[PDB]
Design a protein around this ligand. Structure first.
Ligand SMILES: COc1ccc2ncc(C#N)c(CCN3CCC(NCc4cc5c(cn4)OCS5)CC3)c2c1
Ligand SMILES: [Mn+2]
Ligand SMILES: [Mn+2]
Ligand SMILES: [Mn+2]
Ligand SMILES: [Mn+2]
Lengths: 672, 670
DNA sequence: GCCGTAGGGCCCTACGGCT
DNA sequence: GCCGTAGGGCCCTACGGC
């Protein structure tokens, strides 16, 4: 792995640390092999501030760096044995590259501190605009970053040891709260280098990016960036439900190149989950082929699978090209992407969300669409509605995997505060199997529980004699039969006692820890049920309002063109003679504008008219469309002039969604 | 791995063997877990007919099967201990799935022969049209292939043990010639007999590898993967004048539309075409880490970008001018070129290496100036000899330069298609101080890994197999070029040491020429002249077809312009005719009637925008028509005289020579 | 130790002909 | 034991909450 330099005079040799072999190849080709050694790492490296010594010493990358430097570690550190006088951190020019830099600095500070004190640790500054060093040509990496004549390396300086200790503990330590507090206090939502400043700035950059642009869903459409970009890619390429399935590889490749500069595995897996009926309460992707199972089987390699939008996804994208949502520049400025989707159904709550960010995480359970829309409607008629009254519509979560929820206390607290533990229980019954013997049959399991794994845990309990009475354990699940896990009970043994033991000792009963954090105005916020519904309704009002305004500008523009076309047809002979006598388009246009009192747009539309538009009935067809337009314009102005008419329209469109996509509740909420 | 069934009564139990987890998932979701077990493998399994016994017993997939079947193997085989009465081979419905089936049968016949005799081995028949079982939904896999109610399993039967023995030996054995003879003799361009199954499945695989994978076409010098990559770049306008395009998008597009294989095969093929140490005339312009002479691979495809090189434009030029035949792609949803126009002799220019079945190919790269000069000489003399052609084509010209020793190997290769060419590194002996010397290597033989060659030298020094070497350094840099330094012990003969390096290391390496290419869709060993002849014939056809295409389009456009000219001459009457018509159809009919216009001309008139009536626009229609009449007669002149056509082929080749022709790199030393 | 978006990479097989 | 198109697949790391 270590591509060492030929010289052995440490004082003149330098080692460059890169993320992996893709970056290492450009580095190796562009380097000066006489004084420049290269050591490719393997992505995110172990955080030594959270790990114990045995884990640290046994990590491959740590070991290779220790061996490569030759100084040893901790108390045994010996600066005189350093094989290089420059250790250069040269990670990729992206937030994950910054994160890797903070991880490496954490390791150097805790295990090779005198290396920093001696001024042997440096930070390279590769240019931005590349996804990794492997995207750069070898000559460009050399000239901009590695060549000592032109490069700008940052020498890492330890100014204050006490402050550094606190900085490393706060940022990289196991105490989440202090890291969360640091983010809240420092977040702004919109040559040498001090190690402390470096750690604070690089870590904040990573933390913020994960929070606002990776792990947390937006309250408005319920989507994280990867999912939003996948659905937008599907829309842009017309991969609608009525059209044939499209190759998964083309989808991932398109999305990766145009909108999401990350690994294909993150993109493909996110798309796959959206297609799973055991993961999404209302699947957003319609998949063809092997898309995984409840047993934790992943999907088939993406070259084998195909995908397209589900019908309900069309509602997430409905009106997106009617100036309802703000588009933004993509990562490289070559494309445009939506900041948020119109989302004509409350997707955040319908499908839920799970995400591990930095300083925080989120866990929002899925809900029944009929119940949610009913809740939105009740809210729209009463801004002062209480959580309890909203619960008359929204009983609680509704998992795609069905099952049971025990009581409403966990649900109530989750809806009132955004946090609460909800007890999920499998659907199980006790039945006879012949000869006076019985069995427990499970047909539904808790949400997010891996069936194969749950079964292995039961088998483990039995094998370790931690539970009495089980004689056999079989997974009889099948496509025809549906989920069916069978647990044979010993003759004369109480099956209900065994079942109760199974709930306590296995994931047959599992808790859902609600933690409703979502992005509100681009900032993470813990929200209760009402707040979530209010932000959603407010998004719909804005979407419907902007759509109406777009349709209005569009209709007025068309009315204006038709006024120009009516004049042209009413004076067609003079229009034609005017054009024929003109040498250029400019002269024709100018002459048409003055002579017939036309705007630039009207004259141009006239010049663009094909001879076939001159047929006998066109003039009547034009005044028919014009009359219908004027009416349409009036209808649009009526909506924008009355906020109650606008709101009622939102209610009507939601009700239509409810009636077409609303379904029965799957999860039974049992009380007692 | 093994997803065993519930029941333990081998009587009713069956085990399905699939290629891997992609296929395994659909199989596991669609099966009847009570009686159906599933063991996913990992692609191509070991060929036990060519492998040694120790290796067979150590191979993980062989072990898993033996353990799953529970019978043992050879003399210790026990049919009564069988865990399943039905072992079902269910590979993917593609040629590689057929190959894996032959590999599985070979293992069963040689190590578990009683299993076959007892009727326990079966072959599933999944539907065609799917690249793998992972592409099918679980329900459709169950219904068509796994459901005992509707499935059609083929029970493998052993009729003649002596014939079977010969069959497995011939098809799967280490003797290549017999397998090649079988291919040549049989090549064509329920219950199931094991011998028939082997012969049919292996032949299906062998033929596909030969005509659609490992061998280049004589006309454009390309294998399907390379042709599909370059065509993909063409269809998405990824030309040299535009920006680099993401490699992942290129690969995704090519895989979905044309090349139904692993993305790694596509990416790596594209990468090689961008390497100036691999291609004498690179076909891909790569941005980023595209590998090195030291065997370093390219960066992951998500990091790199690519586009065509300028010379690649010449491979694709006029492809949309009905110069070459298009064919249906693998699923019938797209069209792809059977061959590229290839306006330069690419087979010989870039060469080729491919390992097929029953045969292989090894064609060295050549200098484009020399090649085109050779083609030109041939065009003036159909009876030209190989010797006269060699006055133009001195021999191979590697991208890595270096030296070739002698001309006899080259001569034999050009006359027969086979010959041994000795390549040598470019090395000199120079002083380094105090009476000491060193050997300096600046060019290495073609396809030689520099880092590996240096380690080989380091190994000889270390093991004391070579005398006189005191230091070994790779001083290569992007700014100073290739430089490998071998320091020599003071007063030792550096020339002797160099000669020894040539004997014991790849510093001297041979290139075994074996010029096999597809000629009329069939593999053929060809000599230098044949390669040039087929190439020239391809060019005459391309230029003739292009000229014919240009004529048809010119005449069509002229026809349309004649309609517009009639309309402009009588524009008032045209407008009135249309105005008095209530519908487009009536206008169409009235225009054709009153002005003796064709349907196409009438539609064109109706489609004309009012802006076309301005002075400049009217003049444009007239000007285009007059230019087009001149173009039509020039085209007719070409098609009326075969010598004029042939001369155009010469001139177009000459222009390419002048623009892309370069100096010879490899020195041929007598 | 799992949930799900992220960083990153390696090793087995067939096939022929040359060493 | 390499070369170059093919079949196939796994493991380590951050991050929070429980
Ligand atoms: C699947 O099983 C294994 C097992 C062990 C491995 N060890 C090392 C590596 C590596 N590197 C991989 C490859 C893992 N990744 C690499 C990236 C691949 N994706 C390539 C790709 C393909 C396309 C694409 C983007 N990326 O867009 C359109 S087609 C997916 C597999 C392994 C894969
Ligand atoms: Mn990176
Ligand atoms: Mn439990
Ligand atoms: Mn396959
Ligand atoms: Mn722990």
């Amino acid at each position: 792995k270590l591509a060492d330099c030929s010289s052995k005079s440490p004082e003149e040799c330098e080692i460059f640390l890169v993320e992996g072999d893709s970056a290492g190849g450009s580095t190796k080709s562009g380097r000066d092999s006489r004084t420049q050694a290269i050591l490719p790492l393997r992505g995110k490296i172990l955080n030594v501030e959270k790990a114990r010594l045995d884990r640290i010493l046994n990590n491959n990358e740590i070991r290779q760096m220790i061996t490569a430097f030759g100084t040893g570690i901790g108390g045994d550190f010996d600066l005189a044995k350093a094989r290089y006088h420059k250790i250069v951190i040269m990670t990729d020019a992206d937030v994950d590259g910054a994160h890797i830099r903070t991880l490496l600095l954490t390791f150097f500070y805790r295990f090779m501190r005198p290396l920093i004190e001696a001024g042997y640790v440096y930070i390279a500054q590769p240019p931005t605009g590349y996804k990794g060093l492997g995207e750069m040509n070898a000559d460009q990496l050399w000239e901009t970053t590695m060549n000592p004549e032109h490069r700008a390396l940052l020498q890492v300086k330890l100014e204050d040891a006490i402050e550094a200790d606190q900085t490393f503990e706060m940022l990289m330590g196991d105490v989440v709260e202090n890291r969360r507090q640091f983010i809240e206090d420092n977040a702004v939502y919109a040559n040498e280098r001090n190690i402390t400043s470096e750690m604070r700035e690089s870590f904040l950059d990573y933390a913020m990016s994960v929070i606002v642009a990776r792990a947390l869903p937006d309250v408005r459409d319920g989507l994280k960036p990867v999912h939003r970009r996948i659905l937008y890619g599907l829309n842009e390429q017309g991969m609608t439900p009525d059209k044939s399935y499209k190759k998964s590889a083309r989808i991932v490749g398109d999305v990766m190149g145009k909108y999401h500069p990350h690994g294909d595995s993150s993109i493909y897996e996110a798309m796959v989950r959206m297609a799973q009926d055991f993961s999404y309460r209302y699947p957003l992707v319609d998949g063809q082929g092997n898309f995984g199972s409840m047993d934790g089987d992943g999907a088939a390699a993406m070259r084998f699978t195909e995908a397209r939008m589900t019908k309900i996804t069309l509602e997430l994208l409905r009106d997106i090209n009617k100036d309802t949502i703000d588009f933004i520049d993509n990562y490289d400025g070559n494309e445009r992407e939506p900041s948020v989707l119109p989302a004509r159904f409350p997707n955040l709550l319908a499908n839920g969300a799970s995400g591990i960010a930095v300083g925080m995480a989120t866990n929002i359970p899925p809900h029944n669409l009929t119940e949610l829309i009913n809740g939105v409607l009740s809210l729209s008629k009463n801004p002062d509605i209480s959580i309890a009254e909203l619960m008359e519509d929204i009983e609680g979560p509704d998992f795609p995997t069905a099952g049971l929820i025990l009581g409403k206390s966990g649900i109530r607290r989750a809806y009132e505060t955004g946090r609460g533990s909800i007890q999920m229980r499998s659907r199980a019954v006790i039945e006879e199997r012949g000869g006076g013997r019985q069995r427990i049959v499970v047909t539904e399991i808790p949400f997010q529980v891996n069936k194969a794994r749950m079964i292995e845990k039961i088998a483990e309990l039995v094998r370790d004699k931690k539970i009495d009475g089980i004689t056999d354990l079989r997974d009889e699940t099948s496509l025809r039969t549906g989920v069916r896990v069978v647990i044979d009970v010993r003759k004369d043994a109480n099956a209900s006692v065994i079942l109760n033991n199974l709930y306590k000792q296995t994931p047959l009963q599992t808790s859902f820890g609600v933690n409703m954090i979502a992005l509100v105005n681009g900032r993470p916020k813990l929200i209760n049920l009402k707040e979530a519904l209010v932000h959603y309704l407010e998004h719909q009002k804005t979407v419907v309002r902007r759509r109406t305004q777009y349709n209005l500008r569009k209709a007025k523009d068309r009315a204006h063109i038709l006024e120009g076309l009516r004049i042209a047809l009413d004076h067609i002979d003079e229009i034609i003679s005017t054009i024929r006598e003109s040498d250029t388009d400019k002269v024709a246009m100018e002459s048409l504008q003055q002579r017939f009192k036309l705007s630039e747009k009207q004259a141009q539309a006239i010049l663009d008219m094909r001879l076939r538009r001159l047929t006998g009935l066109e003039r009547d067809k034009i005044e028919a469309e014009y009359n219908e337009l004027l009416n349409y314009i009036s209808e649009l102005e009526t909506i924008l002039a009355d906020e109650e008419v606008l709101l009622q329209l939102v209610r009507d469109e939601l009700t239509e969604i409810r009636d077409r996509f609303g379904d029965d509740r799957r999860t039974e909420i049992q009380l007692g």
